[PDB]
C-alpha cells in the first residue's frame, strides 16, 4: 500500500516537520541546507533580443561555451537575466517529491514528467577531507546507521549529507537507474547534482547508480526490482 509523500516546501518549517516525522508523514528530521559546508571569464553566447525571448528561444542552449565545459555562467553572462546556465545558483530545481517506499526508506519521484538530461537537485552537504570521511565513516558504522550519505566531490572533498543536506539525500540506488551525478563548476568551485539521463514519467521514482566504496561492511541487498538487478549495494 503506497506510502506517504511530501513536497519540498514541507521540510522548511521545522517544527511542523518534527511533528509530522512522529507520526510517520514525514522522514525523520535533518538540518536543511542550500549550500554546500565545508567542515574546514564568460562565454561567447551572442545575446538574445526583446523579441528572441519573447518568441522563446534559449538564453546560453547546447552551444554555449559553459555549458559544454559544465561551467555555469556568472552575473556578467552576455546574456544577464535570460541565462538558462545558472541552474545551481537559481536553483531551478525539477518539481519532485519525498516519498516512503516499501522497503528502501524515503525516496524522491517526478511531479511532473521530467526530460532527459533535466536538473533534478544539487547534492549539498557538509564537504570533508579525506581523513574526516574516515573518521565519520567509522561513527556511522559504529552508531550502527542504517543509510548511507557520501557523495564524492573531488580529491580531498568528499560530500557528507548525513545531519546537513537538502532532499537530494534521499535519492536511492538502481541497477537500471534513470538519474546520474554531473560535476559542475560554479565559481571557480565544483558542485554536484542530479540529472535525468531519459524521459521521467510522472509519478516514477528517481534513481541512479549509487557508487560507494564498501570500506569491508556486511553487503546491503539492493530493492531496486530491475531484471538486471545486481543483487547488493555500492560500487
Ligand atoms: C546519495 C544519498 C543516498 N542516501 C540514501 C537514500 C535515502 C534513504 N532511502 C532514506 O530513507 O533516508 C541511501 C540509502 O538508502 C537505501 N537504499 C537506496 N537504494 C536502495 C536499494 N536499491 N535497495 C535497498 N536500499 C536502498 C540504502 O540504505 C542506502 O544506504
Ligand atoms: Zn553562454
Ligand atoms: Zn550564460
Ligand atoms: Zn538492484
Redesign the pocket.
Known amino acids: 500500500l503506497v506510502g506517504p509523500s511530501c513536497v519540498m516546501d514541507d521540510f522548511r518549517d521545522p517544527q511542523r516537520w518534527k511533528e509530522c516525522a512522529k507520526q510517520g508523514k514525514m522522514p525523520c528530521y535533518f538540518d536543511l541546507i542550500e549550500e554546500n559546508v565545508y567542515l574546514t571569464m564568460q562565454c561567447e553566447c551572442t545575446p538574445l533580443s526583446k523579441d528572441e525571448r519573447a518568441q522563446g528561444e534559449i538564453a546560453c542552449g547546447e552551444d554555449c561555451l559553459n555549458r559544454l565545459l559544465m561551467i555555469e555562467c556568472s552575473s556578467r553572462c552576455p546574456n544577464g537575466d535570460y541565462c538558462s546556465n545558472r541552474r545551481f545558483q537559481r536553483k531551478q530545481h525539477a518539481d519532485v517529491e519525498v516519498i516512503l517506499t516499501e522497503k528502501k526508506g524515503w525516496g524522491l519521484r517526478a511531479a511532473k514528467d521530467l526530460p532527459s538530461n533535466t536538473f533534478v537537485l544539487e547534492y549539498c552537504g557538509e564537504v570533508l577531507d579525506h581523513k574526516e570521511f574516515k573518521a565519520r565513516v567509522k561513527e556511522y558504522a559504529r552508531n550502527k546507521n542504517i543509510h548511507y550519505y557520501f557523495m564524492a566531490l573531488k580529491n580531498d572533498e568528499i560530500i557528507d549529507a548525513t545531519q546537513k543536506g537538502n532532499c537530494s539525500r534521499f535519492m536511492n540506488h ?2 537500471e537507474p534513470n538519474c546520474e551525478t554531473q560535476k559542475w563548476t560554479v565559481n571557480g568551485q565544483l558542485r554536484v547534482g542530479f540529472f535525468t539521463t531519459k524521459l521521467v514519467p510522472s509519478g516514477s521514482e528517481l534513481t541512479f547508480d549509487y557508487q560507494f566504496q564498501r570500506y569491508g561492511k556486511e553487503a546491503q541487498k ?1 530493492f ?1 526490482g ?1 531484471a538486471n ?3 547488493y549495494l555500492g560500487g
Open positions: 538502481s541497477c539492493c531496486c530491475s538487478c545486481r543483487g
